[PDB]
């Protein structure tokens, strides 16, 4: 539903913090992170 033409700035940060504050996006589109897991696991 919601969104903008340019958003989601700020990256590569790493510091000591009581809770870790983030730059609070307008809406969530990509939860957690991407990874190598595909069509089940192993069977290589």
């Amino acid at each position: 539903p919601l969104g903008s033409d340019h958003w989601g700035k700020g990256d590569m940060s790493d510091e000591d913090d009581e809770n870790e504050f983030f730059d609070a996006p307008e809406i969530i589109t990509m939860p957690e992170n991407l990874g190598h897991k595909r069509t089940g696991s192993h069977h290589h």
Partner: protein
């Protein structure tokens, strides 16, 4: 005591309240007012960007004027034994009277001129 307030008034000032069953998104609006005779840039920060959404994310407030910021808190598995770990933070700094770029105000802003304040997330059940 070493805690102090920013130029912007907040509403609620103390904590963000989330009332509703957490089976769906909760919407909580925060009112920010400017007491000053100057323009001011505002920014919002949160403890989890994949569990909390802030429609504007940022902006500027005029002298004597107010902006309403909608927070959308995402559904989760609540536990009555678990404690709230989540917080909000609002950062503010004075804007010049003749700019078209809000990001440049944050790049000219200094760590000694930057104001902020912090708030917790509260969770309440409908009980009906």
């Amino acid at each position: 005591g070493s805690d102090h307030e920013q130029i912007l008034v907040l509403d609620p000032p103390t904590d963000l309240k989330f009332k509703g069953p957490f089976t769906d998104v909760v919407t909580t609006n925060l009112k920010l007012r400017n007491p000053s005779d100057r323009k001011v840039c505002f920014k919002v920060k949160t403890t989890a960007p994949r569990r909390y959404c802030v429609r504007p994310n940022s902006g500027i407030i005029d002298p004597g004027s107010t902006v309403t910021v909608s927070v959308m808190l995402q559904p989760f598995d609540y536990d009555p034994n678990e404690k709230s770990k989540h917080k909000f933070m609002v950062q503010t700094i004075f804007a010049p009277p003749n700019t078209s770029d809000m990001e440049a105000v944050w790049k000219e802003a200094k760590p000694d001129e930057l104001m902020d304040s912090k708030l917790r997330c509260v969770f309440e059940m409908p009980n009906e």
